Amino acid sequence: HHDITFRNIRFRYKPDSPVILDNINLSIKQGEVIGIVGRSGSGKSTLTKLIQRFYIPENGQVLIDGHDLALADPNWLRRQVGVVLQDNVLLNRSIIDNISLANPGMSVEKVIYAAKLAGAHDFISELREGYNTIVGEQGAGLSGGQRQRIAIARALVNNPKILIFDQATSALDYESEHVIMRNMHKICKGRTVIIIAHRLSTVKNADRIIVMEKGKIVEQGKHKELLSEPESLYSYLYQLQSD
Ligand SMILES: Nc1ncnc2c1ncn2[C@@H]1O[C@H](COP(=O)(O)OP(=O)(O)O)[C@@H](O)[C@H]1O
């Protein structure tokens, strides 16, 4: 059983626009943790946009959990996928409102569980106003790494079977980075995970790494296998990011 399948996917953003995704074929097993890497503009983000049916491919199919997304209920699909957004925590609103910003009438309990997996609960619980803390600046003063753990909690709150991490657009403080990496196995447990990675090192221990270039998957495998292809793009990108 594959949780996510792309078959022969062709996609451009607008009728005249350039083909961005060119005959993408991908099958991700349930519970697999996938890293997608590649230069900027290679199509990484577009791939995840298709998973959420934000856009519709001119050719080929996307299937989630067996189901062709053409036919799947858009509300169900929405609940099936949690996305860890970058820089998308509403400042004028409380931590709990921010975490439950999908189903506002859900359990404080479910909010807490998700913050705990995300490694946010401990810092939230030591705030004067706790979960009612208004996230925004002067109202509290949450750091960027703290807001990011809130973003993970948000993605996790409805217990999605698929979790997607959008590419990091920023550097997090060492403590936030540390807590997240320490909790990653708990966050991903029981879910099919896609991580769009800035630094290759981020997805070193993924079950499989997908290497995209100019809208195509050019290489795929575990890190060690990808580095064994002598002239691989993966090796080149790996060398470019080495210290
Ligand atoms: N909304 C959009 N409309 C038109 N082109 C877009 C849009 N979003 C992304 N693109 C383009 O599609 C290509 C791949 O984008 P993207 O999927 O974001 O790559 P990546 O995540 O690898 O950096 C780029 O040429 C980018 O400018």
Side-chain angles (χ1 to χ4, degrees):
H1 182 268
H2 301 74
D3 259 357
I4 303 167
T5 306
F6 288 71
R7 312 216 260 231
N8 302 107
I9 282 277
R10 189 173 280 265
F11 178 75
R12 67 188 53 183
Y13 280 95
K14 287 186 289 188
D16 202 63
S17 279
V19 180
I20 299 307
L21 266 29
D22 193 355
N23 194 34
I24 298 292
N25 289 286
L26 175 58
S27 292
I28 308 166
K29 275 172 214 150
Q30 190 284 319
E32 220 173 348
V33 174
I34 302 294
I36 307 187
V37 295
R39 304 187 173 94
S40 294
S42 52
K44 299 187 297 303
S45 164
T46 292
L47 212 48
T48 63
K49 300 187 203 177
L50 295 201
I51 297 176
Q52 299 169 82
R53 193 112 170 127
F54 290 166
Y55 296 95
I56 297 169
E58 60 193 61
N59 193 258
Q61 319 171 87
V62 179
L63 290 53
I64 298 303
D65 199 16
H67 312 307
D68 193 330
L69 290 190
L71 290 164
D73 187 298
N75 302 282
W76 172 85
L77 172 61
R78 187 209 260 193
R79 289 189 312 268
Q80 246 47 198
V81 186
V83 181
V84 183
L85 300 167
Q86 287 291 298
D87 294 285
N88 210 94
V89 179
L90 311 178
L91 306 181
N92 284 300
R93 296 204 64 189
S94 70
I95 293 171
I96 187 149
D97 281 1
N98 266 295
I99 291 170
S100 73
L101 201 70
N103 181 178
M106 60 156 45
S107 281
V108 69
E109 297 88 16
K110 288 161 104 181
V111 172
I112 296 295
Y113 184 72
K116 278 171 171 173
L117 286 172
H121 176 64
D122 291 350
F123 87 70
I124 297 173
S125 75
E126 305 196 10
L127 263 35
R128 187 71 190 73
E129 310 307 316
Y131 281 88
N132 295 314
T133 300
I134 306 298
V135 171
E137 318 293 301
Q138 176 173 50
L142 298 195
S143 73
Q146 278 177 165
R147 291 189 304 277
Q148 191 57 211
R149 282 171 285 168
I150 292 164
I152 293 162
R154 181 178 146 190
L156 281 177
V157 72
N158 218 319
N159 186 210
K161 79 180 186 220
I162 293 162
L163 184 60
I164 299 169
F165 286 76
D166 286 342
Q167 190 181 317
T169 307
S170 302
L172 308 181
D173 61 281
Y174 179 94
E175 200 189 312
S176 283
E177 275 276 293
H178 183 269
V179 163
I180 292 166
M181 292 317 287
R182 238 81 179 299
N183 281 203
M184 269 298 290
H185 75 285
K186 284 182 189 159
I187 288 151
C188 292
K189 199 154 87 292
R191 317 175 197 284
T192 298
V193 183
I194 288 163
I195 299 161
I196 303 308
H198 217 250
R199 297 89 50 201
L200 303 200
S201 74
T202 301
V203 292
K204 197 198 290 285
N205 297 127
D207 298 321
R208 275 157 73 206
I209 298 162
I210 298 306
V211 185
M212 290 181 84
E213 166 69 5
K214 295 171 183 291
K216 280 176 162 298
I217 299 168
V218 296
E219 301 161 4
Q220 43 190 302
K222 295 189 157 294
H223 170 70
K224 175 220 170 184
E225 201 56 33
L226 288 169
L227 291 178
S228 293
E229 308 192 59
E231 283 64 69
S232 65
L233 185 50
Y234 187 81
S235 287
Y236 179 74
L237 277 342
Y238 171 92
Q239 292 170 322
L240 281 180
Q241 284 155 43
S242 184
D243 165 271

